């Protein structure tokens, strides 16, 4: 095996076509399916893999009760091929309530954070064995991307945060070669709160679109140089902001150099990537709740501040259905790098009081240079047919 480099250009994207759907919640009503949250897709050179933070229990289980807590000792990173539901034969590759997984072309690297909130330890498991570990440096909740990391020429970069979820936090970018942390760069630039990044390879570097839980409904951008370990940071230029909660389309704004201070007190994991001067971004249709999901391109939305000329809008999940975390992952094609994204379809407690569990499904969409149609691909599970 050779080190995966991502040297091909980005594929032409005219939109996104459906790629995968697990139907996990629908299958949970008639089988042993893991309770999961915060899923992501990461691909090795041959095939793509599902990842999720299991809750240590199945849905039709007494332990699925009150599975809405983010950090428990029983949370493990589940891993199987994309399209295979998280059944009892699923492999829990590590203990983690925060995770990030990437393939360098030779072996899988898993960054897994578990332990106490104030004294968390992040384990760096490469090729199935623990190679390195770090402790919490701010003595607050240490976390990571909750999505795939990016390895360029054997150097994997992961964005880790440790600090306040509603204030200043110490975000560090960790550079990892074969599981060993060779460098650590603090976040530098205009972004004032970076967490839960969706990182994609933009050769020769790594571009991450993160989530601002402090002050911005516009998404921070982190540009990682994997050679000299330098970090630049800004915000997405488009005036159509991708974080929720947010202002409506006519009142939202972004100026690429600071948080917009427009319902920036929270956020959701999302994604964005640049197609030249334009930006392809996905966001929930609901401005307040994580209900629905849409993707569109903003013309000059990456270079021109406060750009609101949107085009090629696709409804991934309609308004009336719950969405959740979304993230980007890249696939090496024959001649170019394709940008694909997943959407988490959260179901259960904290919005739906008909059941005691909180699990999710995933729907995956890959960028396409051809044509496509419309449609909605929600969870599809009747909450009245599920076990309580």
């Amino acid at each position, epitope marked *: 095996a050779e080190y995966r480099n991502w040297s091909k250009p980005q594929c032409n994207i005219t939109g996104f076509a459906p790629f995968s759907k697990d139907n996990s919640i629908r299958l949970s009503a008639g089988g042993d399916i893991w309770v999961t949250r915060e899923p992501y897709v990461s691909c090795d050179p041959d095939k793509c893999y599902q990842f999720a933070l299991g809750q240590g229990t199945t849905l039709n289980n007494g332990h699925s009760n009150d599975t809405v807590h983010d950090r428990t000792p029983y949370r493990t990173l589940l891993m199987n091929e994309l399209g295979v539901p998280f059944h009892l034969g699923t492999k829990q590759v590590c203990i983690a309530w925060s995770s990030s997984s990437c393939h360098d072309g030779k072996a899988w690297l898993h960054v897994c954070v578990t332990g106490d909130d104030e004294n968390a330890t992040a384990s760096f498991i490469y090729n199935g064995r623990l190679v390195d570990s770090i402790g919490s440096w701010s003595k607050k909740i240490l976390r990571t991307q909750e999505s795939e990391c990016v390895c360029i020429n054997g150097t994997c970069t992961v964005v880790m945060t440790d600090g306040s979820a509603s204030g200043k936090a110490d975000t560090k970018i960790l550079f990892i070669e074969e599981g060993k942390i060779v460098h650590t760069s603090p976040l530098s*630039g205009s972004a004032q709160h970076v967490e839960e990044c969706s990182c994609y390879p933009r050769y020769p570097g790594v571009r991450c679109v993160c989530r601002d839980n402090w002050k911005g409904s516009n998404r921070p951008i982190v540009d990682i140089n994997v050679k000299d370990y330098s970090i*630049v940071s800004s915000y997405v230029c488009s005036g159509l902001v991708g974080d929720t909660p947010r202002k409506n389309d006519s009142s939202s704004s972004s100026h690429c150099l600071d948080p917009n201070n427009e319902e920036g007190g929270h956020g959701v994991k999302g994604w964005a990537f640049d197609d030249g001067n334009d930006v392809w971004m996905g966001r929930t249709i609901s401005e307040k709740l994580r209900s629905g999901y849409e993707t569109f391109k903003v013309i000059e939305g990456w270079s021109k501040p406060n750009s609101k000329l949107q085009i090629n809008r696709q409804v991934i999940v309609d308004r009336g259905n719950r969405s959740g975390y979304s993230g980007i992952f890249s696939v090496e094609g024959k001649s170019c790098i394709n940008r694909c994204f997943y959407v988490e379809l959260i179901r259960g407690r904290k919005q739906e009081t008909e059941v005691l569990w909180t699990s999710n499904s995933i729907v995956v969409f890959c960028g396409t240079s051809g044509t496509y149609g419309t449609g909605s691909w929600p969870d599809g599970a009747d909450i009245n047919l599920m076990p309580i």
Partner: antibody, heavy 126, light 110 residues
Framework: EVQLVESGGGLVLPGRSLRLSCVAS????????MNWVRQAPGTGLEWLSY????????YYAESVKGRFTISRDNAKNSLYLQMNGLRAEDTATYYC????????????????????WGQGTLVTVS | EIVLTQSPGTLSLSPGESATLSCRAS???????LAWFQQQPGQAPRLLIY???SRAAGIPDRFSGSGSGTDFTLTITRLEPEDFAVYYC??????????FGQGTKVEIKR
């Protein structure tokens, strides 16, 4: 043209207070970030304070943190530096600098710098 | 904190020659956040190169910036009498202590 004129300064006694004013002209004041840079006589440039376009984000140098206080009035296009507890080490020419951002489409990541500097104001603490 | 260190604290060159000024960052600094300023003995600082590689408006092609990470360089080919000043490299935009370099004076050698 973009111009910044620093006011205030003069002669002050140690432990007193001063309020420099940087009046901006030729650009939308609220859209750019403002910085205070002082240069002691015979010494290099020293960056002191930073303020965002709306004043929410403010940074201070370790030397002047707690004593100095930066503020701005976007309606009056004015940048203020309220100094407190002045010492002899605060004798310097104080510059008001505006941050500028250039996209740099080759890199695509918004190079950020201080471009427009005023002629400065001399503050002597004695 | 990024601490910038200009290596040639004082430089002695001759008109028409090429001067090379270096700025060293304590940690890896992005090129986007390094700028070069030229200050005459009785004038305000003037921005020459921003982004460590791109000349400012009105700056002649004499000045050329380069470098990334921890090493940044300023090149002044075909020196002129107005190019003998104090040159500062500043880290701005990366981390809140936006400090300047200690400065580099370019002098006429005789």
């Amino acid at each position: 043209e973009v111009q910044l004129v620093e006011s205030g300064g003069g002669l002050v006694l140690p432990g007193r207070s001063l309020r420099l004013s940087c009046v901006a002209s030729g650009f939308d004041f609220s859209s750019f970030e403002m910085n205070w840079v002082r240069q002691a006589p015979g010494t290099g440039l020293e960056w002191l304070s930073y303020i965002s376009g709306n004043g929410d984000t403010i940074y201070y140098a370790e030397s002047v943190k707690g004593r100095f206080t930066i503020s701005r009035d976007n309606a009056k296009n004015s940048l203020y530096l309220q100094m407190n507890g002045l010492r002899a080490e605060d004798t310097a020419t104080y510059y008001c600098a505006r941050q500028r951002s250039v996209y740099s489409t080759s890199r695509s990541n918004w190079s950020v710098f201080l471009d427009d500097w005023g002629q400065g104001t001399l503050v002597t603490v004695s | 904190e990024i601490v910038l260190t200009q290596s040639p604290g004082t430089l002695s060159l001759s008109p028409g020659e090429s001067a090379t000024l270096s700025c060293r960052a304590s940690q890896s600094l992005a090129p986007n956040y390094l700028a070069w300023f030229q200050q005459q003995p009785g004038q305000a600082p003037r921005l020459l190169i921003y982004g460590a590689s791109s000349r400012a408006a009105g700056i002649p092609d004499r000045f050329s910036g380069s470098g990334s990470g921890t090493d940044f360089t300023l090149t002044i080919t075909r020196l002129e009498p107005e190019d003998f000043a104090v040159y500062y490299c500043q880290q701005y935009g990366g981390s809140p202590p936006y400090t300047f370099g200690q400065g580099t004076k370019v002098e006429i050698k005789r």
